[PDB]
Amino acid sequence: LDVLNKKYSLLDHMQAMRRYLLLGQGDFIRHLMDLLKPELVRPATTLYQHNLTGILETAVRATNAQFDSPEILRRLDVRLLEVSPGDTGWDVFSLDYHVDGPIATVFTRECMSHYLRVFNFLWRAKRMEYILTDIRKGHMCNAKLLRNMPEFSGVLHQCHILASEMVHFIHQMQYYITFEVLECSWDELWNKVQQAQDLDHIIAAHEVFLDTIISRCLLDSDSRALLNQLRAVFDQIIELQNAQDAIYRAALEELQRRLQFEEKKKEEENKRIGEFKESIPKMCSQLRILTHFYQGIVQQFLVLLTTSSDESLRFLSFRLDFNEHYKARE
Amino acid sequence: KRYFLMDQGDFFVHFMDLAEEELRKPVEDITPPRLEALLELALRMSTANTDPFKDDLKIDLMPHDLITQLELALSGLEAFSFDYIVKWPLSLIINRKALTRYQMLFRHMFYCKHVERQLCSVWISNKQWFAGAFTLRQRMLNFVQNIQYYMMFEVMEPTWHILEKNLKSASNIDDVLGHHTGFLDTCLKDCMLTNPELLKVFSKLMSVCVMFTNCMQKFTQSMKLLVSGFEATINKFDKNFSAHLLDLLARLSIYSGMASVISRLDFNGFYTERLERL
Amino acid sequence: REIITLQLGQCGNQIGFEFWKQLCAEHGISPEGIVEEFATDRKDVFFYQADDEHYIPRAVLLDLEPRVIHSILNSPYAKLYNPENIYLGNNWASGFSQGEKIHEDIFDIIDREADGSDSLEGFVLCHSIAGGTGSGLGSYLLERLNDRYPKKLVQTYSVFPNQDEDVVVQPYNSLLTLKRLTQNADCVVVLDNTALNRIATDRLHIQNPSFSQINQLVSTIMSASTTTLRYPGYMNNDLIGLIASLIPTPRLHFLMTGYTPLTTDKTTVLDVMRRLLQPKNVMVSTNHCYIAILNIIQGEVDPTQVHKSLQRIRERKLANFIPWGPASIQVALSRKSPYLPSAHRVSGLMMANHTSISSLFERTCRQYDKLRKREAFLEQFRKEDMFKDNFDEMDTSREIVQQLIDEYHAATRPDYISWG
Amino acid sequence: REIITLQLGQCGNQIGFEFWKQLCAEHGISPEGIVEEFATDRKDVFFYQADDEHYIPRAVLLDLEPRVIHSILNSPYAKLYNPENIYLGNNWASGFSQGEKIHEDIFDIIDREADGSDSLEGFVLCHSIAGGTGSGLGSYLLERLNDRYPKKLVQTYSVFPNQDEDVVVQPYNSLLTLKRLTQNADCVVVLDNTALNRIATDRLHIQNPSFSQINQLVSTIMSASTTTLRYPGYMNNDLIGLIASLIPTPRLHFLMTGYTPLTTDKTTVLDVMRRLLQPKNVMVSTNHCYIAILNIIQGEVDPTQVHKSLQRIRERKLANFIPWGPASIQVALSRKSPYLPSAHRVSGLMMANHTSISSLFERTCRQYDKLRKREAFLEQFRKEDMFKDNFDEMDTSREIVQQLIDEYHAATRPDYISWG
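Output (structure tokens, whole complex):
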């Protein structure tokens, strides 16, 4: 154990399997993902690995990760999975930590596969949180130009209230993943390595560490339907960025046309007021059924959560509702 | 002894008030995570938190009352207990049978802690002019507090003092188990978990007092927001309380201190015999 | 739950300060307030707990024209408290009217510590009867906190003014305050100056500086009466269960107090019980007899000896008392306190309903009546005349305390099947 | 991205200087500015990094007729900054007109640090409401940096002037500045002088030199609120994600602040959460209740205890609040800072939307209205008359803040399906 931790630096590698893969460093992940958004919204047939590698260099030496060991930062590199003709960069992307030395004896391809699975989970959630903070950003930017139109007040206010329960949901999942899926497990791992005097102990501790991560995350065989429910609440997240923008591509532009009509004057505008009375009920009735759809799928998540594992998943149930919204409208 | 024999009473006076309103409801209406949080509480807020063993305590129920020593529509006042679990070197002395005997003692003591605080709580609700219910309330509360003290300092504390001398003289573990068995047998036998009828007279005694609390508070809140049809129920409760009291005193007088409790209950020696025996 | 104490009067503020000094010596804190690591005990029912390491006692400090409060400032316990409630008459009516005009801000001070804590159990009133600044104002706030909150308990610490006849307006004041204590308090802990002065002259050689000694005697009593609540016992360790055992009749809530060490400046239980029943170890001054007694023990007490001791008093015929109910004499046990120098290890308490005090009451009911015949000792104050133009409220209070005396005289006998 | 701070007002420049002193004690630099080799931490969002070994804080230092800035010069931190932006009224309108006439060169100073860094996230405005030199000018530049850049975030550090009634022109000034903060800022961090003065008189014995102490209290708050951004956490460690969780309604962006050590001159999480919810550990002064709370922890915190602690407040019925959405109470965890002497290891934060502050607002909405009836307290300044001849912009701002009060009163209830 002594020669493996210094001549091959086995422990410093283990510190960098939590930082990077399990998002334990966190600033490098968000600073990489802000700069990679227009690339990944494209189809990944027009994306190549050198362009990922290059912007990775910016992220690494702009962020704190530059001050860690050259070996562990060298072992971080991008990877791309196999392509399909129908493709999205968000669908095919990975970070791969290389395994060099005789460290293959300690870490097998199977634990890499489970590593990639939990990375896919915390990939989905970390994208949808960025989309929702764009929703809040659009609310704070466009509305103080929309102070010369009070007829949108109903539908804009309805979109404002629809944002906030999504903020509550994607702000209680991301503590259920923090303080129970990456902190209690980290305590039991860091206890059972630092006391252990044999390699057979430390391997069999990382094994049960990782299998408990598979149990606590929603990637088990029996929790599949649970995940298939959870994907449905991400749906109405990403859908919302179109629908909200479907306001501004008609609402905000007409106000600039109105200000140019006013600067002309230094018969037309009646039709502009009337086409609002044609447009507003349809977008309102669309937002209403999107609302009811979203409420129905999150309530159907919460009723399914009651029958689960005895203690571990049950904690999440408490997380999703602290006010008994789903026990006053149920 | 800290949780079963009530050696931290601040734990109980916090826990009972914060727990009874959820505890009172029938079976299959309570959920165990709620009560587990409220219990873990009144332990962590109290100064019973100082001992190193505070997570062995768990809550379970007894849906089967005193019948088992040879419920189905209520719980938490008829199905409630604590189980303090055991490790391997400590399961040689305190094992399953000792734990069940401790639990069936603690369940009978939970009722005597319960009914007294019902009487004290209905006292504060009202701090010519019907006042005979005051006399009945005072008689019952004096009775149940005397019974409670008599159990506390006649049986439980002196034999615990004796155990503190006996276990320091032990030379093998077959003396330790023998002292623990004798302690357990004496404390179970001297309390009211022993007769061929197991003193159902005492259960009916406390039953008419919880009926008395219930009817008196329901009448006073409705009067605040007949007066002789209400009188008949109280007169009946007084008659039943006196009748069951004479039954308990008769069943103690037949079996040969232990006439102790009478000397406290009637200091003057009034009602000491209102019917000759045999 | 938590218990809030309110002290008014100069003498009341003094004995409240000495009581908090006694509890700072009791509890695990320093005279600056800072926690000591030598310490079982609970500091929550009388002390607000921050993490400012100076646990602030739950006292409401109100006053009129502060004189002795300046002497309260010049002390090392000025860092124990600063809740900023110090604010700048001679009769019951003048003090009542002065308490009437400023009720909003003092009741805001009350609402402040009411909202400060979440659990609330009781209010202790530290007050002197017919004390001038205390009288009138204390009865007014007594009426107001009972009228505003009917779910809490009202206890009072009170001394009795007796000098064997000088203040000529004292029977009016004590008469009205006794009406307000009977109808606006659920229990009253009654003391007098005369019996403690007698015991103080018995133990020491004191004639002039008596006040400084009797304060110590009072504080030892009030700490002793709270040892069962501050240290967790299992019997009457809340205020409500304590008062629920002591009242056989809702007009009788006055508690007799004693203390078995008469001087502190081995034992078995029958010894301290028999010493306890003597009237010289009692602190409060035809057949007159107890209705029901509760005695509380503090010390190294073996459990089986208390049973034998109670059997001993049963065999002595020291029970020459006979009320109309089987509600009997009461023993309780609490521990002697650790953490301080504790001399005279085993010490006793009594909490008893005794009707001898009615004689004390009728002395006031004598005196006022004589002055009512003379009509030259009311002193005719202007706010007193405006507050009551006919002075018939004193006559109505005399009627109420006359009914109180008749109910006492009925409660003495074993015949209370009819009302007295 | 990087965040630029702007301080104006003499009091604002003082607390900005003390804040940079606190961060120089925090970060791995010396009081000359030179790097210390003892040090995890990021010095990029508030400090421009050259290799001049004196990392210059990203502060814009503007002033009017520098008096206290000379005292800022005589300090060992005069080598920390020199961006050369020091330039030489009494009302909101006079200060607004004085900010109007010199807008080009101060906006050139803004465009200078805008072009200086490549990534830009937010502007912090360190400003005192109705402060004289700060008022008018700060509202003007607030309008201008929101109008010029709609892609960035606007945060404000602001104290509330309250003296319980002297300046007669303050309700006009605060009324107009509150309009400008509601419509030209996305989030406002609200403080008042009175609650910090009350807590300062609680902890210390201070009456006259209060300013020097409350500055320290404020600086501890502003450093604490930035510890999650300067040290890398994973939740709300950018400004945008932090503000995106705290706003349930775009008219409500005022954040309540508390601090669990009330005095610093062992713990589990349920203890500091319960101490946190108390109004005395809160720094900002019918049913009024929170809409949504975020609490931030800093210290040696075990991860499973925070889950039990949140379960504890759920069981206490300390949640006697009820808005109309399931957006709930929020916990977050960040580390306690190394590298400095750190006493009172575990300390807390709260960031909460509370409607009790609306009472504070309507006090101003009371006062101005009374002066609007009298018409003798506007003081009739000449630039004030030329800037608005009818003074109907104050009436329109009163209409806007009246709609703000109605929206607050609708937000209190669980019925906000209709607009208030």
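Helices of chain B lie at 9-23, 32-45, 96-124, 132-166, 173-190, 200-224, 229-253, 260-265.
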